[PDB]
Amino acid sequence: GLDAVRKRPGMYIGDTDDGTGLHHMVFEVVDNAIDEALAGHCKEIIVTIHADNSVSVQDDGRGIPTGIHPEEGVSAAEVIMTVLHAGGKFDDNSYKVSGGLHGVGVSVVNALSQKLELVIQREGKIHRQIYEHGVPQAPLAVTGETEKTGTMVRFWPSLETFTNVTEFEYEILAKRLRELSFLNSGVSIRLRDKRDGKEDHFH
Amino acid sequence: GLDAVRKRPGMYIGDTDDGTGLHHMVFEVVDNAIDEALAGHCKEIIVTIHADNSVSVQDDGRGIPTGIHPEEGVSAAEVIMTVLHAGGKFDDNSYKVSGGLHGVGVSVVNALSQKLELVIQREGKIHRQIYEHGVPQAPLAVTGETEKTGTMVRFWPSLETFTNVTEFEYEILAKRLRELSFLNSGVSIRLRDKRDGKEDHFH
Numbered sequence: 001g002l003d004a005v006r007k008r009p010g011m012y013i014g015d016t017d018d019g020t021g022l023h024h025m026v027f028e029v030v031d032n033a034i035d036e037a038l039a040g041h042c043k044e045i046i047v048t049i050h051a052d053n054s055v056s057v058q059d060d061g062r063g064i065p066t067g068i069h070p071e072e073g074v075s076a077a078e079v080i081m082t083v084l085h086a087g088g089k090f091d092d093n094s095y096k097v098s099g100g101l102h103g104v105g106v107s108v109v110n111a112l113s114q115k116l117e118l119v120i121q122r123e124g125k126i127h128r129q130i131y132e133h134g135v136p137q138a139p140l141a142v143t144g145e146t147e148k149t150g151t152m153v154r155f156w157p158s159l160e161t162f163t164n165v166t167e168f169e170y171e172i173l174a175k176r177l178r179e180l181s182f183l184n185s186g187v188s189i190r191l192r193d194k195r196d197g198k199e200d201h202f203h
Numbered sequence: 204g205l206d207a208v209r210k211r212p213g214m215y216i217g218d219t220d221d222g223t224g225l226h227h228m229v230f231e232v233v234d235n236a237i238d239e240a241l242a243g244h245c246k247e248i249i250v251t252i253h254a255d256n257s258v259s260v261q262d263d264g265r266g267i268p269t270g271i272h273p274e275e276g277v278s279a280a281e282v283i284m285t286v287l288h289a290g291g292k293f294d295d296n297s298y299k300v301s302g303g304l305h306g307v308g309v310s311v312v313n314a315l316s317q318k319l320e321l322v323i324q325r326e327g328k329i330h331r332q333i334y335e336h337g338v339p340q341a342p343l344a345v346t347g348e349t350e351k352t353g354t355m356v357r358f359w360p361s362l363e364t365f366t367n368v369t370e371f372e373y374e375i376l377a378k379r380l381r382e383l384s385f386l387n388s389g390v391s392i393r394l395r396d397k398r399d400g401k402e403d404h405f406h
């Protein structure tokens with residue numbers, strides 16, 4: 001399970017000491033947002049490096065589905081955050097539909113994050129869910145009204161896991177983000193660094 | 204296990220009826236070859252569409268390691284062909300080293316292949332291994348001498364699994380291959396179609 005991930009992180013996210021794994025945490029989440037872009041629902045992805053060296057990834061896609069599978073009793077949100085290798089494609093009712101997994105899965109990003117905050121806007125509502133080291137602190141909650149749809153996630157990588165290189169390199173993130181923007185022509189991808197105020201916009 | 208894959212293929216490889224999954228079989232193997240390119244050992248990858256609508260992917264990298272883990276007793280070759288989600292990075296002695304999984308894993312390509320033939324050239328030897336529906340027909344065998352190093356694999360997708368679209372589209376494969384070649388500047392990527400003789404060379 002995720003216990004196996006926390007125990008041998010380099011085997012799932014990549015090297016936890018030279019910065020490879022650390023930056024892969026970002027791309028793993030960005031890959032998911034691109035799926036929404038490819039489905040033609042996401043027009044913009046914004047990646048922000050925060051001063052405390054957490055990273056947020058947000059998109060204006062449909063929002064990860066939050067309602068439980070009417071048979072299995074678990075939402076797509078819960079599944080992809082807490083089940084190793086969970087990925088692929090779901091529908092609005094959290095039924096799993098055909099689609100390949102790709103990457104390692106964001107449940108790994110969650111497991112190796114000291115804190116991960118998930119905020120999902122859909123069906124008129126803001127939904128919130130805090131995880132710590134991959135453990136949900138409460139069930140996913142409705143906390144307000146909204147007209148927007150999309151997903152926002154911020155994660156703080158665990159300093160129990162990542163060593164030596166514990167801070168994100170702008171150039172590395174800007175490298176991957178500039179590539180993806182050229183492959184998906186319609187999708188705007190912004191990169192913001194809140195430490196010094198540098199912005200990039202790949203469209 | 205791979206039994207779960209054969210049972211619900213669309214959940215692992217993607218849609219098995221509209222051709223998405225079928226072409227993903229190729230890219231899943233090509234992604235692995237690129238890892239060798241990135242490590243600076245592979246200078247060329249060649250993808251061939253065969254007349255019977257099997258596809259081969261070959262590279263001139265180091266060759267997948269074939270010797271058993273001195274503790275676990277299994278080679279990298281065996282692991283990545285027969286273990287779901289097996290991927291990442293190994294060393295020459297089949298120890299697993301830090302590295303992220305990415306994609307779904309080629310053991311899925313194997314599971315959904317009526318036949319897969321693996322030929323590995325390294326340490327002076329040609330090594331061969333036939334799989335059928337993911338089952339090894341014999342242990343990996345040494346069948347001759349060679350000075351070359353590299354990996355060759357040909358797979359015949361299972362017509363028990365893939366329906367309707369059972370033949371590969373050149374343009375789709377050429378799409379992905381042309382992209383990857385531009386991202387990895389030093390690596391030549393060829394595409395050959397043996398049905399009509401069309402060739403492409405992305406460098």
Ligand SMILES: C#CCOC(=O)NCc1cc(-c2sc(-c3cccnc3)nc2N2CCCCC2)[nH]n1
Binds near residue numbers: 031033090109110
């Ligand atoms: C860290 C972390 C987690 O945050 C994220 O994974 N954020 C990236 C993301 C994922 C999605 C959506 S919206 C959606 C959907 C499907 C059907 C109907 N409506 C919405 N599905 C997804 N994903 C499902 C899992 C595989 C990637 C795509 N939007 N933004």
Ligand SMILES: C#CCOC(=O)NCc1cc(-c2sc(-c3cccnc3)nc2N2CCCCC2)[nH]n1
Binds near residue numbers: 232
């Ligand atoms: C279908 C199918 C299977 O065929 C393939 O996966 N073919 C692609 C491939 C993979 C490799 C090698 S060589 C090597 C290596 C490592 C250390 C020392 N020497 C060689 N490692 C790999 N892979 C290990 C698994 C993840 C992708 C890279 N060469 N060509």
